[PDB]
From Swiss-Prot:
Reactions listed under catalytic activity: L-proline + NADP(+) = (S)-1-pyrroline-5-carboxylate + NADPH + 2 H(+); L-proline + NAD(+) = (S)-1-pyrroline-5-carboxylate + NADH + 2 H(+)
Listed name of the protein: Pyrroline-5-carboxylate reductase 1, mitochondrial
Quaternary structure (record): Homodecamer; composed of 5 homodimers. Interacts with LTO1.
EC number: 1.5.1.2
Lineage: Eukaryota, Metazoa, Chordata, Craniata, Vertebrata
Binding site residues for NADPH: A10, Q12, L13, S36, D38, N58, V72, K73, A99, N232
Organism the protein comes from: Homo sapiens
Amino acids binding NADP(+): 8-13, 36, 58, 71-74, 97-99
Annotated positions of the N-acetylserine modification: S4
PANTHER family, alphabetized: PYRROLINE-5-CARBOXYLATE REDUCTASE, PYRROLINE-5-CARBOXYLATE REDUCTASE 1, MITOCHONDRIAL
Listed result of changing R268Q: In ARCL2B; may cause skipping of exon 6
Mutagenesis / variant outcome for changing G250E: In ARCL3B; results in a reduction of protein expression in skin fibroblasts from the patient
Name of the gene encoding the protein in the UniProt record: PYCR1
Positions annotated to bind L-proline: E166, A239, T240
Main location: mitochondrion
Length: 277
């Protein structure tokens, strides 16, 4: 309540959470702070008009925060923990949202400046900008049951949230992590298609969007199985079971696996390649 939050990073994910948080009415524009190593107009300048506090020193950020978010490229993290670790008091919890980066590698490198650092590994996606982001997290070792709560609550204010045994955090990144981009790509497609049919552009994009959204809900607000909802929507005639067949004919499912697998396998590498060199 007397809480403040900071993003040692910036860019999208920062802006994402920051935007979601303010809107969710949990924090306050000014009661947040993100550091601008350089300043990327889009991101940075955006936050400015938003109301957040931006400083070139991802240090004042650490002092200004009760809850610290590590939102920087995975390989950058090291060049931070050993630049801020010293400034890591005990009051604050450190939530690293960087991909692949292990809770361990952070603690056992950050502890070198503190007996027991409080850290949690996060995994979110851009949709947080609304309240439909899908977030997963894992509690550190020096993380009290009162921290997961604060976490599981600060995030549940902007999307979905659940404790997850870190070893899973890598798959999750493929699915819900990258997912929003597999979607943005699939929408653009559909529009283009709907358009190659007579529908105007704006109109097409919105129907495509709406179509997806709706599908989501039905699936979430029930079990059924994505399999069955497919059945409920296709009359023996055609019009749909037909479109399916086409998708089904070009390994449409196959290609989505291929992309989650890829997202994962990559995230593994990025980290399991930062373990040594
Ligand atoms: N702070 C928030 O504003 C949150 C909103 N929601 C939302 O979800 C919406 C649709 O409804 P929900 O019933 O509230 O979404 P959804 O929580 O049911 O999102 C999907 C989640 O289904 C969970 N899952 C949920 N019920 C399950 C059962 N059996 C097995 N796995 C299950 C899964 O963990 C999965 O992460 C959207 O309206 C969106 O508002 C969900 C969490 C937080
Ligand atoms: N935390 C709520 C958010 C919203 C709603 O459905 O109204 C949920 O996912 O159940």
């Amino acid at each position: 309540r007397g809480m403040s939050v900071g993003f040692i990073g910036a860019g999208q994910l920062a802006f994402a959470l920051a935007k979601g948080f303010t809107a969710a009415g949990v924090l306050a524009a000014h009661k947040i702070m993100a550091s601008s190593p350089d300043m990327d107009l889009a991101t940075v300048s955006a936050l400015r008009k938003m109301g957040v506090k931006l400083t070139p020193h991802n240090k004042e950020t650490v002092q200004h925060s009760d809850v610290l978010f590590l939102a920087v490229k995975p390989h950058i993290i090291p060049f931070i923990l050993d630049e801020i670790g010293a400034d890591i008091e005990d009051r604050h919890i450190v939530v690293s949202c960087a991909a692949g980066v292990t809770i361990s590698s952070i603690e056992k490198k950050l502890s070198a400046f503190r007996p027991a650092p409080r850290v949690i590994r996060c995994m979110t996606n851009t949709p947080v900008v609304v309240r439909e982001g899908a977030t997963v997290y894992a509690t550190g070792t020096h993380a009290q049951v009162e921290d997961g709560r604060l976490m599981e609550q600060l995030l549940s204010s902007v999307g979905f949230c659940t404790e997850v045994e870190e070893d899973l955090i890598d798959a999750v990144t493929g699915l819900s992590g990258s997912g929003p981009a597999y979607a943005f790509t699939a929408l653009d497609a559909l529009a283009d298609g709907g358009v190659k049919m007579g529908l105007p552009r704006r109109l097409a994009v919105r129907l495509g969007a709406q179509a997806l959204l709706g599908a989501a809900k039905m699936l979430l607000h029930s079990e059924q199985h994505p399999g069955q909802l497919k059945d409920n929507v296709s009359s023996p005639g055609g019009a749909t079971i037909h479109a399916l067949h086409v998708l089904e004919s070009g390994g449409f499912r196959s290609l989505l696996i291929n992309a989650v697998e890829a997202s994962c396998i990559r995230t593994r590498e990025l980290q399991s390649m930062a373990d040594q060199e």
